[PDB]
Amino acid sequence: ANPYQRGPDPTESLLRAARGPFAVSEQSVSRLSVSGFGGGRIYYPTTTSQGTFGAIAISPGFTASWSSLAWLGPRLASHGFVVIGIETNTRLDQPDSRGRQLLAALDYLTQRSSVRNRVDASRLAVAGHSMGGGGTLEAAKSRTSLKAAIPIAPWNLDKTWPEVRTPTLIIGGELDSIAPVATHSIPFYNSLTNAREKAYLELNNASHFFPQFSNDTMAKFMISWMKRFIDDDTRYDQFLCPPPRAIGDISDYRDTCPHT
Predict the structure, then answer these.
(1) Is residue 79 annotated as part of the catalytic site, yes or no?
(2) Which residues lie below 8 Å from residue 13, measured CB to CB, with a gap of 6+?
(3) What's the domain of life for this entry (predicted)?
């Protein structure tokens, strides 16, 4: 009934496994071959029989390469998404620049890439770590048609985001000293007054570098948010609403349930 629904009815175990239910193919994008971002890598479900998929562009942080987040490529793509993980024009690009580069990557993916026919160009998303998470907010501010945004330990000197309409999940690290949640993540979250839905997931005792290593709780919520909002897949609301208890590896969760 939902034309964008993909994959089996979900469970906690399905979300916590190293791969979701789709085999993944990959394609390198050389820096020599694109303008407006530094190239990167595309990850996509090999099969086309279940339809096209939504897509997400993902940015690393200041000083970092895509390899700092590369485990996300196959893991997210294997749940039924096309992922373009970017290298930035230089390692020292600022958040606003990273936002423009995320949009340039989505435009390349849908307009020119050799996997464009696999992507539903109407169902796009952004995510990123640190300044890449700041850039995730910038991209959502510039492109209100984006269906999901996931800033991860985001860093940005711009603290307010009233233009953002996209459903936004901010994932923070409780003990982050580089982008402290009290001055980055939480102010961003409170400022998302026009986001259609939003959530804040705070990982107990986590440092700034929690995303550089496979993290099942992080992946569970990122995948659920992507499913719910990129695919309109209401089956994944079970993991989001009511909100999870702040226990174990979750030190805080803030929500806008119900997701109408």
Answers:
(1) no
(2) none
(3) Bacteria
